[PDB]
C-alpha cells in the first residue's frame, strides 16, 4: 500500500547535495528577491515584502483560493509575510500575527508597508498554547520537514488538530506540510466534510517539498490532488533541468492605511450611459462579482472574455544571434519580463493604481489654482486653442495601426463619432471608456478622436515647445535635450535636480484636473463645448475595461474613478507637462520662502505675495526647468529646494525611492542628469568641435532591441534593422552599438526599408527609418540641422564620428575589454553569415569598418 508521494520521499533521501540542488528548484516558479534583500539589508521598511511568503500567499489570493477579509489572524508569522500582504487587502480590517520567536524561530520584521497599522505581529506566541480566537481569516504557514515522512505525519497532523477548532464558516489556508501519508489523507477527508475547502500545489514551492494548502474556497478530490502532485514531483527528478521562471516580487507600498477614506463613490448621472450600453453589448454574460478586489475604483459589473496577454516578451532571433555576449547578461533578460495576462495586469492594478490620493490643504489649493491661472495665460499668449478634425486625425493615424487606417476609412466610424458628438454637445457620454468586436474597436477610437478633436491642439500645435512654454522640451528631439541640460546648467544657483516622482498619473488630483481644465476659458464657444465634455464626462468621470483572472474563467470589470490621470487618454502628456510646471514652480517658491508650512495651512491665503512672485520671477524660473510629462530637471536659485518638500508631497507629487521626509539629491555635473530614462556626454570631435550625445545603460538598448514586434523572418530583421540604424544616429559614440548596428546591416538585405517603429517616445523623430546613406543622415541631424554646431563643415568619414572615452563607455554598460566581446569581435563575419543563410540568397552589403 505504498503511496507515490513514500516513493518519492525514498527518491529524494538517497539525491547526493550535488543533485539534490538541482532538482529542487528545476521547473519551479521563483521571485527575484534581489532588491528587496538588498532593502531589507539597508533598513528599508516601505515596498518590500520581508520575505518569499508574501508572493506565495498571493498566488492563492490573486486565484480566489482564499480572500482574506475582516479580522485575519496569521499563525507561525515568522517574519510577517502573509500578515503585511493582507493588510493592503480590500476587506482586511486588522490583521493579528503570532509567531514563537527566540532560538531558531523567526522573528516579526517591522514595516511601514500600505496598512501597518493595521498589522499587529506578536513574537513569544507560541500558536500550539494558544486558546482559538474569533476571526474572518485563518491563515497558517506552518510546518518544518523531516528525512523522516512519520516524523512529518506527526508534525502534520499536529497542525492539523491545532488549527482545526479555530475554523467556523471563515476563510482559511493553511500548509499541510506532508499531505500524502494515508492518516493525513484519512484526517484532510474528515475535515473537508466538516468544513469545506480543498488541497492546492503551490508552484513557488520547491520540488524538495510536497506541501499543499487546504484552502477555503473550492471543492474536490484530495486523494487525486496529491496524487496529481506525487506524479508531477516523480517526474521531476528525470526531467532534463529546467531554470526556474522568474517573477517579478511584489510592492507592498508605503503608509498608512484609513479603510473607510478607500471606497469611491460614482457619478452615476454622469457614468450611467456609458455602463448601460456596456452591459447591453455584453448582456449575455454579464454579471456583478461581489468579490472583485477593487478598493479605490468604483465597480459595476463584469462580461466574460478570452484572456489576451504573455507573461514575458517576444525575443528578436536576428538581434539575439548577432548579439551573443548579452544571452548571459540578467539586465538583458529583465528587459523581457513584461506580464501582460490578466495575473499581471491585476498584480500592477493593486500595488500601482488602487490607491487615494489625500486632498491637499486648503492653502496649497491656492497656490495651485494662482499658479495655474497664471501659467495658462503665459502659455497661451501667442497662442489660441483650436479644433482639431477628421482629417487631422485621419493623417495621423495613416502615417504612423492596420485597423486604424480602416477605420478611419470607413463611414460607419465617422457616423458613430458624429452621433457621440452630439451627446457630448447636451452634456452626455455613451460610449467613451478606456482600456487599462468592430463595434467595440470603433467606440474605442471614437472616444480618442473626440478626445483628439477637443484636446489635440496642445501636441499638435506644440503648446509644450521650449520657445512657447519657457520649461518644455516638446518637439525638441533626443538629439537635443542634451544640449537643453547643457544651457540650464550654466544658470548660476543651486545643484541641478531630477526627482522623478512614484506613478505621477495615479497622483493627479481632483484640484489638479480643475486647474487643467482652465484652458477652456481661452476656447472659442463650440470648442469649449466640446472641451469641456471631455474634460467633465470622461476625464473626471473614467469608465475603465480591466480584464481578471478568477477560478472559472477571465472577466473584464467595469470600473469608475473620478480622479488620476486616465493614462489610455488623448492629452497625458500635455496636461502632465502643464501640471508638473506648476508643481515644480510651487516648489521653486517654497525653497525661496514665499511660500510657507503656515501659507499651507491658511484657509483664506491672500493672493498678493503669490502674484507678484510669478509676474516678476515667473518666466526666470521656468527657464531653469527642463519639464516632459512626468519628468523635470529643475536648477533652483540655490539648494533650499532641495528641503522644499511641504508642498510637493502635500500636492499628492511623492517622490519614488526615496523616504518622503529625506531631502533630494542634486547634481551639479549636468552630464550626470537623469532626465527621460537618459544622460548626455559631451564629447570632443576628431576635428575639434563639441557634441552633445544620448546616452542610456548599454543593456537597456540591446535589451530593448532584442524584444520583437507583432513567422515573419522579414519583419524580424526590418525591425532589427532599425534598430542597427536608430543606434547609428543617436548611440554611435557606444562602442558595442556601433559595431553591431554595422553587423545587423551588413546581415539585412540593403534594399529592406526598415519596418516597425523601435520607440513611440515623443522625443523620437525616427530619421532612422530610411535607405538613405546613415553618414549623411548623421551630418543632417549632427552638424546641418544642430543650432548648438556653429561650423557647418561635414564629417567625410565614420572615423572621425566620436566615441565615449573607454572608461566612460565601460561604466555606461560597455563590454569593451572583456575576453567574450574580444571573441563576439572575431566571430562577427560568422555571425552575419549565420543571419544571411537564414533569410536566404538575397542582396547584402558589408558595414563591417
Ligand atoms: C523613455 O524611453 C525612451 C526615451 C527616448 O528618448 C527620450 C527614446 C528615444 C530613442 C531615440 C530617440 C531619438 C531621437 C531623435 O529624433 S528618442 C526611447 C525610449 C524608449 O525606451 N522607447 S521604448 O522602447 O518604446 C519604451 C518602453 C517602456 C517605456 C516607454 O516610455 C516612453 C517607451
Ligand atoms: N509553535 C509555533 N508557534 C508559532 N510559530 C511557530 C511555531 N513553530 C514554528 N513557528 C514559526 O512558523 C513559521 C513558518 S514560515 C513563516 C513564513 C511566513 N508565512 C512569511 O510569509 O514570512 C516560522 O517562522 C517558525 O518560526
Ligand atoms: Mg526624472
Ligand atoms: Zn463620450
Ligand atoms: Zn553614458
Known sequence: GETLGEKWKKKLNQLSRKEFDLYKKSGITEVDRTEAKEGLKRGETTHHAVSRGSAKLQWFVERNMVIPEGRVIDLGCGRGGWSYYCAGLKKVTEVRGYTKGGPGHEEPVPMSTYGWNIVKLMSGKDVFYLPPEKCDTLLCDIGESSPSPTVEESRTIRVLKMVEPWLKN???????????????????????????????????????????????????????????????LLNRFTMTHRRPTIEKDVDLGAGTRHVNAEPETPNMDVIGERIKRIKEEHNSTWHYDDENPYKTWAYHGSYEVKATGSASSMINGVVKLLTKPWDVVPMVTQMAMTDTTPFGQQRVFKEKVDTRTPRPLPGTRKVMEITA?????????????????????????????????????????????????????????????????????????????????????????????????????????????????????????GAMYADDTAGWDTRITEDDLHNEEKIIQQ?????????????????????????????????????????????????????????????????????????????????????????????????????????????????PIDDRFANALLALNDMGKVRKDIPQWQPSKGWHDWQQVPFCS????????????????????????????????????????????????????????????????????????????????????????????????????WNRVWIEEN???????????????????????????????????????????????????????????????
Not at 419 to 443: D, F, P, T
Not at 563 to 568: A, F, L
Not at 599 to 626: F, S
Not at 692 to 707: F, H, K, S, T, W
Request: with cysteine; proline share 4%; aromatic share 10%.
Open 170 to 232: 471563515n476563510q482559511f489556508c493553511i500548509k499541510v506540510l506532508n499531505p500524502y501519508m494515508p492518516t493525513v489523507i484519512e484526517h484532510l477527508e474528515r475535515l473537508q466534510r466538516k468544513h469545506g475547502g480543498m488541497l492546492v500545489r503551490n508552484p513557488l514551492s520547491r520540488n524538495s517539498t510536497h506541501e499543499m494548502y487546504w484552502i477555503s474556497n473550492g471543492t474536490g478530490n484530495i486523494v487525486s490532488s496529491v496524487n496529481m502532485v506525487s506524479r508531477l
Open 373 to 493: 491661472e497664471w501659467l495658462w495665460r503665459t502659455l497661451g499668449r501667442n497662442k489660441r486653442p483650436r479644433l482639431c478634425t477628421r482629417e487631422e486625425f485621419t493623417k495621423k493615424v495613416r502615417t504612423n495601426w492596420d485597423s486604424a487606417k480602416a477605420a478611419v476609412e470607413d463611414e460607419e466610424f465617422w457616423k458613430l463619432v458624429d452621433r457621440e458628438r452630439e451627446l457630448h454637445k447636451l452634456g452626455k457620454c455613451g460610449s467613451c471608456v478606456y482600456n487599462m468586436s468592430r463595434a467595440i474597436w470603433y467606440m474605442w477610437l471614437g472616444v480618442r478622436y473626440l478626445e483628439f478633436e477637443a484636446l489635440g491642439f496642445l501636441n499638435e500645435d506644440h503648446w509644450f515647445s521650449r520657445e512657447n512654454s519657457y520649461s518644455g522640451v516638446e518637439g525638441e528631439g533626443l538629439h537635443k535635450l542634451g544640449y537643453i541640460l547643457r544651457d540650464i546648467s550654466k544658470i548660476p544657483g
Open 523 to 635: 476656447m472659442d464657444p463650440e470648442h469649449r463645448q466640446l472641451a469641456n465634455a471631455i474634460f467633465k464626462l470622461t476625464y473626471q468621470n473614467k469608465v475603465v475595461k480591466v480584464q481578471r483572472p478568477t477560478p472559472t474563467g477571465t472577466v473584464m470589470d467595469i470600473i469608475s474613478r473620478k480622479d488620476q490621470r486616465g493614462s489610455g487618454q488623448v492629452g497625458t502628456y500635455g496636461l502632465n507637462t502643464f501640471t508638473n510646471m506648476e508643481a515644480q514652480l510651487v516648489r521653486q517658491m517654497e525653497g525661496e520662502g514665499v511660500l510657507t508650512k503656515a501659507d499651507l495651512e491658511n484657509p483664506h491665503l491672500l493672493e498678493k505675495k503669490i502674484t507678484q512672485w510669478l509676474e516678476t520671477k515667473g518666466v526666470e524660473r521656468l527657464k531653469r526647468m527642463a519639464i516632459s510629462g512626468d519628468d523635470c530637471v529643475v536648477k
Open 678 to 777: 537618459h544622460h548626455f556626454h559631451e564629447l570632443i570631435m576628431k576635428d575639434g568641435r563639441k557634441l552633445v550625445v544620448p546616452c542610456r545603460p548599454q543593456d537597456e538598448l540591446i535589451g530593448r532591441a532584442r524584444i520583437s514586434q507583432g513567422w515573419s523572418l522579414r519583419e524580424t530583421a526590418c525591425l532589427g534593422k532599425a534598430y542597427a540604424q536608430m543606434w547609428s544616429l543617436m548611440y554611435f559614440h557606444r562602442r558595442d552599438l556601433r559595431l553591431a548596428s554595422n553587423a545587423i546591416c551588413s546581415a539585412v538585405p540593403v534594399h529592406w526599408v526598415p519596418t516597425s517603429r523601435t520607440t513611440w517616445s515623443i522625443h523620437a523623430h525616427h530619421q532612422w527609418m530610411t535607405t538613405e546613406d546613415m553618414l549623411t543622415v
Open 787 to 849: 543650432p548648438w554646431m556653429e561650423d557647418k563643415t561635414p564629417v567625410t568619414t565614420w572615423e572621425n564620428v566620436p566615441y565615449l572615452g573607454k572608461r566612460e563607455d565601460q561604466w555606461c554598460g560597455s563590454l569593451i575589454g572583456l575576453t567574450s566581446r574580444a571573441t563576439w569581435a572575431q566571430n562577427i563575419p560568422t555571425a552575419i553569415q549565420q543571419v544571411r543563410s537564414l533569410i536566404g540568397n538575397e542582396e547584402f552589403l558589408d558595414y563591417m569598418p
